[PDB]
């Protein structure tokens, strides 16, 4: 099953909801209300984390970022997890940003449930340790 | 579709109580499509396995849930109606204490402002007519026939077709000779309903008229059958 | 530096009167609700087009009292009775949402 | 920000007969440079033209503004041409030598 | 003035600053945002057309002078219904005169 | 051993807080403090109530002629003050939740168009409601 | 031209808004209006051909609206022709307003 | 793309033979009004936008398909070929835009006179109409009804036109509308019975290794249909040859996709050939290309 | 100094409106039906309006939403 | 200082065919990039 | 009682009859403070300001001195609590009291309630006084409003309105009346700032 | 439940401060009759008093839905619009049912409609 | 070495908006840019001879550089860069003698840090800085010929 059909399946999830007239208290997103983590998939490999944060900031303030990278070479696998400060920004981003094109590639944005953080057992990098323990965020 | 198929197959192995007890409280869920899915699963499970497994505490859950789901529909399809019929036919004589509640609900929703709500109420009478015969409660169904007779003057053809369908079911279940209002009162009421050009009305009325024509022809004069006979030539268009 | 006095023209008053006459002349064919509906439309056309100019014209106020009484009397004629206590004003003034005729009022003023 | 059916080639109806080549190029050359113009000889096609623009955006603009123009006391009807078929074989030998000369030129493969 | 202020602040006009003056004006301000505004920008000379309809249609139009899409609704009579119910005694005092108790509806709120 | 496990537990606590949504926690804190303050106070508040009176007095209202002077005083009184970065560019397109963008954002709108279409159909319901009323009540 | 057509058809359709069991000619006129809603390009082509070539027309009927103090002539024109006239009416007023034909002393104006 | 330069001799492939180029001039280098009174002109009255006669309304975006009906010409003057193609053009206009009486009569006449017209002159005007960017689905339906009526007529005269029909009908196999999908299947199975296995095999051979996955997708769909019509033992050797081919994995992928589609379409019919089919697919489970491994698992599940 | 290298936002400096304002009402005719006088059109809203209309079910515990936990427990911690 | 709107505000329309509801749709509209 | 006043207002088309109907019911004098109050509230509910309510209130002010004193009380009461009002209700009360001031149904003495300072006035109060003076100007004109606003017999009353003691308040009130569009009233204050 | 009336400060203060025996009259419905029937008014009152009986503090929190909802000085209950009373009545029923279910360890979602009527109304 | 997670912008995001077919465009027009009110002409005269009188009025902004294919106003001589200058009409807020403020469209020059630079009235101007352009001014692009003088139509 091609990834584009996954992008289309989330969009049809939304259109179908509109046709049936479902209320927001029982929307599909309400199953993911507890979490503030969203999966982004299909990204171009040229994008770095400043790019991801630069664009997905339209809907709120990003708390943490996990663009998963190859262990040996360090290059990007293409998918990362973002945590928003508001949980409602996840609704806005899954609706609005699913299936948009960046450098000619469509991306899928979906809610992630019970996201489990990476263990700091590895001492491979330092900046990743800073990102895990502290993470990106405005400083007064 | 895959989800409802798989849950029915699980219920074959595990048992109807174990599956139905996990999803019965979502007949009160406030997403329409969800309730619709849950209704389908219960419908097929009690169609395949019967209701010998369902104890008394879960049948109140079930009867209350299908009444809630029936009162809270918008999408205008047969799924809640089929589900209601399958469940109460599976329950059989165990549903007899719940018939006052059901009759009161249906009797009340027959006159609210929405045409769709009144239509659905007459559909529910047509599905549960047989259950009241098995529950031996012919007095109540007799009363219903008397009530639906006053709803004949409807101006919305969808509601009138369902009133007629409900009447058709009561005539079948109780019989022409014990029917109230008597067939003498019902047939001359029906002959101007023949004029209605809407197909649902014509269909349900012609069946009713044609069935009286053989099993009950002494309830009308020969001049009446002649003029009603003349009227039938417009039904051929 | 100046005042302008406003008064409804005589032709426009005559048009309103003939509009009401035409309502009453067709009352054998219209139901009570439609008769009242026709009256309400006439009165809204007059009052929303003239506004204040209607206050200063006493001829109109006399004509409006007459016309409101003619509409009510035609509804009572339709019911084969003119006795005022079978027809208290609640049956006319009550809004259509409660079952009344719902007529709009202009003729219960002091002239 | 363009629909897929836009094309460099324009098809022109209501063209007054025996109009000059200069007048034609002057009318259509305002919107951009012109790749080619073909004018109908045969009497069934006589009085209509195809104009190819070198730029797709100029052709877009010429359709958008050119339509209903008044030349020789008549309105001008412009449309896109839908190049939906091919009229000759693509002459594999010429394309082969051309590709061989390109690949030889830049050491590609 | 609010359009100048919104250009200077470089923000977009919202419902809240037009909330007060929405049903004001001649033409009413809400006619600028009606769904068919693009088409109605091309309807010219409509007022004299509405005058001339008397030679085409047999009835006589009382609102010959106006159009609700071009002027907006120049009147609003909704409080008249409310004050008429209170002038007549309230809903309960009115329904004393009817057959309401014979309908055996419990409450008068769902009469329709 | 024990120290590493305790550090892992603290890390899990920090991550747990992040995934629930930080803004959600701040709002729930505010809700509990409001409800406590309303539990102290009696059942009926009158217009004479003190904090409602304070609230209505410091309500700035549109059309205030001296509003610019009070604003310029606020501008002068807060010049030497250190705050978190916030988005400052051209005004962003609205959300259904009124969440303000993060400071990393470019200001380029990259939506599907979900959000505009949502506002559009919510406006279309009002129009259809008006027509439905006129149709419904026309024969009575 | 489709905006002008849409306006013209809304006037013509508004004349028939409420009535039931109309004449044969009125049912014909509603049929033509719905057919022009379906494909506007055909209707516009017909209008342009009428305006270029038609010069001999059908007869109009006359009646009088009795307003009790005087009588007003009411003219009945065939439906096809009426659609062509309504389109020309909209077009002429739009271009005359754009080109400033009527100086401002000529009333009723759209603005007031 | 469209932006790319266009050579002078290949451009000639883009236009019909009626027209002659102009030479560019030298002066070309590439890179209010008041009140006036008018003179009478008759010329705007003279120009017409519609064909003359009992012909339907000609929509503005159809002009380049039916432009020869606008100019008026004596029949005797032009050649028998040109009167034949003008006749076909009138009939097609009546089928697309006519009222149901016009549509019925024209349909009948293009069916009865189909062989007399020849398969050539029909298809080079029917096929441009189906390629148009502004069809509605009822017009598409009427056009493919014309194609399968004439496909009974010229049963053996459609061989040079097999591939041209496929690229105008194979999209219907993936149409979202169910009845379009079924009528696309019926016209491909009739086309297979009309042309026979060898013509079909030769024609679709190129599309197995095509560079676009659209063409490969719909060709894999269409072979399933051709196998329904002619039967699996007919093309089982060709299909085995296309699944073994070790130059291209696109062709291996496409062959295994054909086997999947045959099992979805044929259902119970594939059983007498099951061991022939599995042996074609077995080498794909262990392939080095991951798409091929996935399609072999999906083909096994279908079987 | 003007910062360069920023992605272009295609925004105009001239006055904008938000989408909530438009298409609040639809239609192309006057509301007067050609001057038909028989129909009832004095007002434009319902007297009572839409405002229980639905059957009561006990809702999902919203204390996890409003306060994050049971209100009494939240007071206990505070 | 004018009792009706100044005409320039009305000539500018905030934020196309009106027949779009009525015409039958095209095959090209429901099609995606593929 | 509030209901019957409200129905009496809404039943009468002209201001003259409304007053006649209210007088005919013959309330006791103890009611009068409420009646005047009700006449204001009915006025505030309207969409626009209508002359009816100003004229009705004025005729009550000319009939008896009790009503005039009662309206003087209501001006102070309303100005104290202006922040409670919505903006339309605020605009209507301002235009009604400007009407009573202009036609001299009400003494200018009441205007000593208003005290202009940064800390004395809330924002709604500042809007109220804006509409009030902008309106009084529109009825009278600047020379007339100046002539009445600086007067020897009314010198004590306006001192809160024209604050001579504190330079900071004097500069505030100068700026205030300037931003309204009533700059001319400030000129004698400006001199007092120069000296 | 009329002990719930003793919790209400108007009645509560009037009873505590009193130095003499006396008979006072109040209107339990402020303006409810104008828009609802006295059948509905009794149901709304029953619900308010049950919720004040069951849990006084959450009922105070519920009965002031905004920072701006006030009461008229002669009324007892807040001035709310009608859709506001629809929402407030839902919240008071959730309060009563939640406290019953927490107390007696039933899941409330299992309960039928007739049970819900008995619990709200105060049956055993 | 692994390129561990840097937190800095990259050109990739930029190339999605202001990327012309020839190459990525460094400059993006400001929101305040507007089509000019009047007609401004640019006069080019390589010494004594006068070259074609350009007409600038048409559009809000012009890009001047070496690329004939990218630049609105190409300048061929080698001393000019690929992207050299932007001639930008923008609305600006100005105060009149009455003290009333308002909006006036004015032309500006902005030089994208070209290596040779641009000289306005024989004085080189600092990059990334907007400069208002007076009624009569002379524009010089590096070491190339053809000094440009701007005049609007009404100027007489």
CATH of the domain at A114: 3.30.70.330
Residues in chain F within 8 Å Cβ distance of C37: none
Q: How many domains does chain A have?
A: 1
CA distance L110 to chain B (A): 6
A125 occurs within a structural domain: yes
| Residue B216 vs residues B164, B171, B176, B224, K46: alpha-carbon distances, Å | 18, 12, 7, 13, 70
Q: Looking at the complex, does the CB of residue C96 fall below 8 Å from at least one CB of chain I? A: yes
Q: How far is CA C8 from the centre of its chain?
A: 17
Q: Which residues contact M118 (CB under 8 A, 6 or more apart)?
A: M84, M85, M109, M111, M124, M125, M139, M140, M141, M142
Nearest by Cα to H254 from H195, H193, H210: H210
CA–CA distance, H33 with H25 (Å, rounded to integer): 32
The structure tokens 């039931």 sit at G20
Separation between Cα atoms, residue C109 and residue G64, nearest integer Å? 38
Distance of alpha carbon C26 from alpha carbon H175, whole angstroms:
62
Token pair 């040859």 is found at H241
> Which residue in chain E is spatially nearest to C93 when comparing CA positions?
E84
CB atoms within 10 A of CB H59: 16
G37 touching chain J per CB within 8 A: yes
Please check whether residue M42 is in contact with residue M54, taking contact to mean a CB–CB distance below 8 angstroms: yes
- What is the sign, positive or negative, of the torsion defined by CA atoms of M86, M89, M91, M94? positive
Of K98, K108, K106, which is closest to residue K158 (Cα–Cα)? Answer: K108
User: Strand, helix or coil at M94?
Assistant: strand
Question: Which strands sit side by side in the sheet containing M118-120, from one edge to the other?
Answer: M54-55, M40-45, M147-152, M138-141, M118-120, M123-124
Residue L18: burial class (beta carbons within 10 Å; 0-12, 13-18, 19+) = exposed
Instruction: For chain D, say whether H132 makes contact (Cβ under 8 Å).
Output: yes
Q: Which tokens in the block code for residue I33?
A: 């039906």
Give the span between the Cα atoms of B143 and K58, in whole angstroms.
70
Closest by alpha carbon to L62, among K168, F43, E62?
Answer: F43
SS3 E112: coil
| Interface contact K21-C109, CB threshold 8 A | no
Residue M61 bridge partners (DSSP):
M88
Alpha-carbon distance of H185 to H264, in angstroms, equals 14
Q: How many CB atoms lie within 10 A of CB M101?
A: 10
Report the candidate in K61, K15, K17 with the shortest Cα–Cα distance to residue K35. Answer: K61
First CA to last CA across chain E, in angstroms?
A: 47
Is residue M118 within 8 Å of residue M111, measured between CB atoms? yes
Query: A124: domain range?
Result: 3-134
Strand order in the sheet with D77-80: D77-80, D9-13, D49-53, D34-40, H19-21
| CB-based contact, L71 to chain E, within 8 Å | no
Nearest-angstrom CA–CA distance, B186 and B208: 10
Q: Do chains C and G touch (3 or more CB pairs under 8 A)?
A: yes
Whether the bond into E27 is cis, omega within 30 of 0: yes
Phi and psi dihedrals of F122, rounded to 5? -65, -35
Query: In terms of CA atoms, which chain E residue is nearest residue J16?
Result: E38
User: Which of I55, I59, I60 is the best residue to mutate to test the B interface, defined by the most B CB atoms within 10 Å of its own CB?
Assistant: I55
Closest partner residue to I18 (CB to CB) among F90, F94, F134 is F94
Exposure on the CB side of residue I47, measured as CA atoms within 13 A = 22
- Looking at CA atoms only, how far is residue J15 from chain I in angstroms? 8
What the block records as the tokens of G66 is 């009795």
Joined together, the tokens standing for residue H5 give 């330069």
The answer to whether the CB atoms of F124 and I18 lie below 8 A apart is no
Distance from CA of C110 to the nearest CA of K (A): 7
Half-sphere exposure of I14 (CA within 13 A, CB side): 7
Is position A112 within any domain? yes
What is the C-alpha to C-alpha distance for residues H45 and G60, in angstroms, rounded to an integer?
Answer: 26
Per the DSSP assignment, residues forming a β-bridge with M124 are M119
Within a domain: A139: no
B64: helix, coil or strand? helix
Residue B64 token pair: 């209350």
Alpha-carbon gap, residue M25 to M13, rounded angstroms: 13
User: Is residue M118 classed as helix, strand or coil in its secondary structure?
Assistant: strand
Helical ranges in chain C per DSSP H = 10-25, 32-50, 58-78, 90-93
Whether H60 sits inside 8 A of G53 (CB atoms) is: no
What does residue M58 show for φ and ψ, rounded to 5 degrees? -60, -50
What SS3 class is residue M101?
Answer: strand
Q: What are phi and psi of K145, to 5 degrees?
A: -70, -35
CA atoms of D5 and L26, how far apart (whole Å): 78
Residues L62, L93: Cα–Cα separation, whole Å: 11
Residue B168: Cβ within 10 Å count: 17
Method for structure elucidation = cryo-EM
Chain F residue with CA closest to K126: the answer is F64
Tell me how crowded residue H221 is: count the other CB atoms within 10 A of its CB: 23
Measured between CA atoms, the residue of chain K closest to residue F73 is: K118
Q: Which two tokens stand for residue D91?
A: 């002459």
Handedness of CA K74, K76, K80, K83 (dihedral sign): positive
Whether the CB of I37 is below 8 Å from some CB of chain G: the reply is no
Cβ–Cβ below 8 Å for M30 and I11: no
- End-to-end distance of chain M based on CA atoms, in angstroms? 68
Could you tell me which residues come within 8 angstroms of residue F83 by beta carbon, excluding any fewer than 6 positions away? A140
* DSSP β-bridge partners for residue M92: M104
Resolution to 1 decimal place, in Å: 2.9
Q: Is the backbone of residue I35 left (phi > 0), alpha (psi -120 to 50) or beta?
A: left
**Chain L contact for F114, CB < 8 A?**
no
Residues 6+ apart with CB under 8 A from B3: B37
Among candidates K69, K171, K150, which has minimal Cα distance to K110?
Answer: K69
Cα→Cα distances A100→I6, K41, K66, Å: 20, 56, 74
Give the bridge partners for M19, in sequence order.
M24
**Considering only CB atoms, which chain F residues are within 8 Å of M13?**
106
Instruction: Say whether C45 and E91 touch across the interface (CB within 8 A).
Output: no
How wide is the angle at C-alpha B22 spanned by C-alphas B20 and B24, nearest 5°? 60
Q: Is residue A140, in this structure, part of any structural domain at all?
A: no
Strand M85-95 and strand M101-111: the pairing is antiparallel
Distance CA G36, CA G91 (A): 17
Nearest Cα neighbor of K75 from K49, K107, K123 is: K107
Smallest CA-to-CA distance from B163 within B182, B189, B188 is with B189
**Gap between the Cα atoms of F70 and K121, Å rounded:** 12
Cβ(H260)–Cβ(H281) below 8 Å: no
Q: Please, are residues A97 and A106 in contact by the beta-carbon 8 Å criterion?
A: no
**Residue M46, SS3 per DSSP:** coil
Cis peptide before B181 (omega within 30 of 0): yes
CA-wise closest residue to E66 among C48, G18, F130: C48
Tell me if residue A38 falls in helix, strand or coil.
strand
By C-alpha distance, the chain E residue nearest B113 is E112
- Using CA atoms, how far apart are residues J5 and B189, in angstroms rounded to an integer? 63
> Which of I52, F52, I48 shows the shortest CA–CA distance to L84?
I52
For chains E and F, CB pairs below 8 A equal 6
Residue C38 near chain I (CB below 8 Å):
yes
Q: Which residue of H has its CA nearest to J24?
A: H136
User: Which CA distances in Å does G107 have to A76, E47, G112?
Assistant: 73, 9, 9
């Amino acid at each position: 099953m091609n990834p584009l059909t996954k992008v289309k399946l989330i969009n049809e999830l939304n259109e179908r909801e509109v046709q049936l007239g479902v209320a927001d208290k029982v929307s599909w997103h309400s199953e993911y209300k507890d979490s503030a983590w969203i999966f982004l998939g299909g990204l171009p490999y040229e994008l770095t984390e400043g790019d991801i944060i630069c664009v997905f900031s339209q809907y709120g303030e990003i708390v943490n970022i996990n663009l998963v990278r190859d262990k040996k070479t360090g290059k990007s696998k293409g998918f990362c997890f973002l945590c928003y400060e508001d949980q409602r920004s996840t609704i806005l981003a899954v609706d609005n940003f699913n299936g948009i094109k960046i450098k000619g590639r469509t991306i899928r944005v979906d809610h992630v449930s019970n996201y489990r953080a990476p263990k700091d057992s590895e001492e491979i990098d330092d900046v990743t340790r800073q990102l895990q323990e502290k993470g990106c965020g405005a400083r007064t | 579709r895959q989800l409802v198929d798989t849950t029915v197959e699980l219920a074959n192995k595990v048992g109807a109580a174990e599956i139905i007890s996990r999803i019965v409280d979502d007949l009160k869920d406030e997403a329409e499509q969800y309730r619709k899915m849950v209704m389908e699963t219960i419908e097929k499970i009690m169609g395949n396995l019967g209701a010998a497994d369902i104890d008394h505490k879960l049948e109140e859950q079930l009867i209350d849930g299908i009444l809630y789901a029936f009162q809270e529909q918008t999408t205008e399809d047969s799924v809640m109606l089929n589900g209601f019929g399958t469940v109460v036919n599976a329950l059989g004589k165990r549903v007899k204490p719940y018939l006052p509640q059901i009759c009161g609900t249906v009797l009340w929703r027959l006159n609210n402002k929405s045409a769709k709500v009144r239509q659905q109420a007459a559909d529910l009478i047509s599905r549960t007519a047989v259950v009241m015969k098995t529950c031996q409660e012919e007095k109540l169904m007799g009363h219903l026939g008397v009530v639906l007779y006053e709803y004949l003057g409807e101006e919305y053809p969808e509601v009138l077709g369902s009133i007629l369908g409900a009447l058709k079911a009561i005539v079948n279940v109780i019989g022409m000779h014990k029917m109230t209002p008597p067939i003498k009162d019902l047939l001359p009421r029906l002959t101007p309903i023949l004029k209605n050009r809407h197909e649902k009305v014509q269909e349900n009325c012609i069946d009713l008229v044609g069935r009286i024509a053989d099993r009950g022809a002494e309830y009308v004069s020969a001049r009446e059958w002649m003029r009603i006979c003349f009227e039938l030539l417009e039904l051929l268009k | 530096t100046a005042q302008c006095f406003l008064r409804v023209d005589d032709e426009s008053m005559q048009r309103f009167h003939n509009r009401v006459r035409q309502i009453l002349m067709a009352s054998g064919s219209t139901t009570f609700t439609k008769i009242v509906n026709k009256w309400n439309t006439a009165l809204i056309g007059l009052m929303t087009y003239f506004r204040e100019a209607v206050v200063n014209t006493q001829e109109l106020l006399d004509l409006l009292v007459k016309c409101e009484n003619k509409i009510q009397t035609r509804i009572k004629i339709g019911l084969n009775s003119k006795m005022p206590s079978r027809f208290p004003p609640v049956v006319f003034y009550t809004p259509k949402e409660l079952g009344g005729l719902g007529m709009l009022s202009m003729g219960h003023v002091l002239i | 920000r363009l629909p897929p059916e836009v094309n460099r080639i324009l098809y022109i109806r209501n063209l007054p007969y025996k109009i000059t080549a200069e007048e034609m190029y002057d009318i259509f050359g305002k919107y951009g440079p012109i790749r080619q113009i073909r004018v109908g000889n045969t009497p069934e096609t006589r009085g209509t033209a195809y104009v190819v623009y070198e730029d797709i955006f100029d052709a877009k603009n010429a359709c958008d503004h050119l339509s209903g123009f008044n030349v020789c006391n008549r309105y001008l009807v412009v449309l896109y041409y839908n190049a939906n078929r091919a009229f000759q074989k693509m002459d594999t030998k010429k394309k082969e030598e051309q590709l061989k000369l390109l690949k030889e030129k830049y050491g590609i493969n | 003035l609010k359009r100048q202020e919104a250009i200077a602040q470089n923000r977009r006009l919202t419902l809240e600053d037009l909330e007060d003056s929405w049903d004001r004006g001649i033409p009413r301000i809400n006619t600028l945002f009606q769904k068919d505004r693009h088409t109605l920008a091309y309807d010219k000379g409509w007022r004299v057309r509405t005058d001339f309809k008397q030679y085409q249609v047999l009835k006589q139009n009382p609102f010959w002078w106006t159009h609700q899409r071009h002027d907006g609704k120049l009147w609003n009579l909704n409080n008249y219904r409310t004050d008429m119910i209170q002038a007549l005694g309230g809903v309960e005092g009115i329904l004393e005169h009817t057959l309401f108790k014979g309908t055996y509806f419990p409450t008068w709120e769902g009469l329709f | 051993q024990r120290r590493k496990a305790e550090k892992d537990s603290e890390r899990d606590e920090l991550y747990a807080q992040w995934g629930k949504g930080l803004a959600q926690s701040r709002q729930q804190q505010q809700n509990v403090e409001d409800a406590m303050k309303e539990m102290q106070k009696p059942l009926a508040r009158y217009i004479d109530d003190e904090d409602l009176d304070r609230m209505l007095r410091e309500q700035e209202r549109e059309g205030d002629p001296m509003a610019n002077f009070i604003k310029k005083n606020k501008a002068k009184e807060n010049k030497n003050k250190k705050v978190r970065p916030r988005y400052s560019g051209p005004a962003p397109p609205p959300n259904r939740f009124n969440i303000w963008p993060g400071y990393r954002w470019d200001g380029v709108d990259r939506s599907n168009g979900f959000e505009q279409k949502r506002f559009a159909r919510l406006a279309s319901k009002k129009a259809v409601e008006e027509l439905a009323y006129k149709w419904s009540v026309e024969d009575m | 031209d489709t905006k002008l057509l849409i306006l013209a058809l809304e006037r013509l359709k508004e004349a028939y808004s409420v009535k039931s069991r109309l004449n044969q000619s009125q049912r014909e006129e509603l049929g033509l209006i719905e057919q022009a809603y379906d494909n506007p390009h055909e209707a516009l082509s017909r209008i342009k051909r009428h305006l270029l070539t038609q010069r001999a027309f059908k007869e109009v009927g006359i009646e009088f609206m009795d307003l009790y103090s005087h009588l007003v002539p009411v003219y009945d024109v065939e439906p096809l022709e009426k659609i062509t006239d309504a389109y020309l009416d909209q077009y002429l007023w739009y271009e005359a307003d754009k080109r400033r034909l009527f100086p401002p002393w000529i009333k009723p104006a759209d603005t007031e | 793309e469209r932006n790319r330069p266009l050579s002078d001799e290949e451009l000639d492939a883009m236009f019909p033979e009626g027209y002659k180029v102009l030479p560019p001039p030298a002066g070309y280098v590439p890179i209010m009004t008041g009140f006036h009174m008018q003179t009478e002109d008759r010329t705007m009255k003279s120009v017409n936008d519609q064909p003359s006669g009992n012909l339907p309304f000609l929509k503005p975006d159809d002009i380049q398909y039916f432009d020869k009906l606008l100019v008026d010409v004596d029949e005797s003057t032009l050649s028998p070929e040109e009167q034949k193609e003008r006749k076909i053009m009138k009939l097609l206009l009546k089928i697309k835009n006519g009222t149901p009486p016009m549509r019925k009569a024209a349909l009948r006449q293009i069916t009865d006179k189909a062989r007399e017209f020849g398969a050539g002159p029909l298809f080079n005007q029917i096929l441009p109409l189906l390629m148009s960017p502004t069809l509605e689905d009822q017009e598409r339906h009427l056009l493919v009804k014309v194609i399968d009526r004439i496909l009974y007529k010229l049963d053996d005269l459609v061989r040079p036109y097999v591939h041209k029909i496929l690229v105008v009908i194979e999209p219907l196999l993936i149409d979202e509308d169910y009845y379009a999908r079924v009528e696309g299947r019926e016209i491909i199975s009739n086309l297979a019975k009309a042309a026979g296995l060898a013509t079909m095999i030769s024609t679709m051979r190129p599309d197995i290794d095509n560079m676009d996955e659209y063409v490969r997708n719909t060709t894999a769909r269409a072979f399933a249909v051709v196998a329904s019509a002619l039967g699996i033992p007919s093309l089982l050797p060709f299909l085995k040859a296309v699944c073994k081919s070790k130059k291209s994995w696109q062709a291996r992928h496409t062959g295994i996709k054909i086997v999947q589609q045959i099992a979805i379409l044929m259902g119970c019919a594939i059983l007498p050939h099951l061991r022939s089919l599995v042996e074609i697919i077995e080498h794909g489970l262990v392939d080095e290309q991951q798409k091929v491994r996935t399609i072999s698992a999906l083909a096994i599940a279908a079987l | 100094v003007i910062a360069l290298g920023v992605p272009n936002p295609r925004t105009s400096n001239e006055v904008q409106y938000d989408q909530r304002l438009f298409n609040q009402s639809k239609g192309m005719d006057s509301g007067f039906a050609g001057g038909e006088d028989e129909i009832y059109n004095v007002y434009d809203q319902a007297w009572r309006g839409g405002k229980a209309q639905s059957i009561y079910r006990p809702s999902k515990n919203l204390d996890k939403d409003m306060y994050g936990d049971d209100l009494e427990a939240r007071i206990k911690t505070n | 200082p004018g009792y009706h709107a100044p005409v320039a505000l009305l000539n500018d329309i905030p934020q196309y065919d009106p027949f779009a509801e009525h015409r039958p749709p095209k095959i090209a509209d429901r099609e995606d990039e593929y | 009682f509030r209901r019957t006043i409200y129905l009496a207002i809404q039943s009468s088309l002209d201001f003259e009859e409304c007053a006649h109907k209210l007088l005919k019911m013959e309330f006791p004098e103890s009611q009068t403070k409420e009646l005047c109050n009700m006449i204001l509230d009915c006025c505030a509910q309207q969409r626009t300001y209508e002359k009816f309510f100003g004229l009705l209130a004025g005729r009550f002010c000319m009939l008896k001195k009790e009503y005039m004193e009662s309206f003087e009380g209501i001006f102070k009461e309303q100005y104290d609590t202006i922040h409670r009002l919505e903006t339309n209700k605020l605009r209507n009360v301002a235009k009604m009291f400007a009407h009573l001031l202009y036609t001299d149904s009400l003494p200018w003495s009441v205007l000593e309630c208003i005290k202009l300072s940064e800390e004395t006035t809330t924002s709604s109060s500042r809007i109220f006084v804006k509409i009030f003076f902008q309106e009084l100007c529109e009825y009278m004109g600047l020379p007339k409003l100046n002539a009445r606003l600086k007067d020897e017999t009314l010198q004590p009353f306006f001192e809160g309105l024209l604050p001579r003691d504190n330079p900071r308040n004097t500069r505030f009130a100068i700026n205030f009346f300037t931003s309204i569009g009533l700059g001319g009233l400030t000129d004698e204050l400006r001199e007092h700032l120069k000296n | 439940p009329f002990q719930a009336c003793l919790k209400v400060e108007k009645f509560g203060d009037l009873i505590l401060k009193a130095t003499e025996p006396q008979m006072v009259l109040f209107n339990l419905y402020d303006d409810w009759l104008k828009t609802i029937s006295s059948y509905t008014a009794f149901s709304r009152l029953i619900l308010i008093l049950r919720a004040l009986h069951v849990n006084n503090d959450r009922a105070k929190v519920i009965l002031k839905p905004d920072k701006t909802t006030i009461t008229e000085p002669h009324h007892i209950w807040p001035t709310l619009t009608d859709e506001e009373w629809i929402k407030v009545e839902v919240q008071l029923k959730d309060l009563i049912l939640a406290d019953y279910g927490k107390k007696n360890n039933v899941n409330v979602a299992s309960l039928t409609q007739s049970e819900i009527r008995d619990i709200i109304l105060g049956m055993e | 070495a692994k390129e561990k997670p840097s937190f800095e912008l990259s050109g990739a995001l930029l190339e999605d908006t202001n990327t012309f077919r020839g190459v990525v465009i460094k400059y993006s027009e400001p929101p305040e840019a507007r089509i000019p009110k009047k007609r401004w002409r640019l006069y080019p005269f390589k010494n004594d001879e006068v070259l074609p009188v350009m007409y600038i009025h048409r559009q809000s902004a012009y890009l001047l550089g070496r690329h004939r294919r990218i630049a609105d106003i190409p300048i061929d001589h080698p001393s000019c860069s690929k992207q050299h200058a932007v001639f930008q009409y923008r609305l600006v807020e100005y105060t009149r003698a009455d003290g009333t403020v308002g909006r006036r469209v004015k032309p500006y020059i902005i030089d994208l840090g070209s290596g040779n630079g641009t000289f306005l009235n024989n004085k080189r101007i600092e990059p990334q800085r907007y400069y208002e352009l007076k009624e009569k001014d002379v524009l010089k692009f590096g070491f190339s010929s053809r000094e440009y003088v701007l005049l609007h139509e009404s100027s007489d």
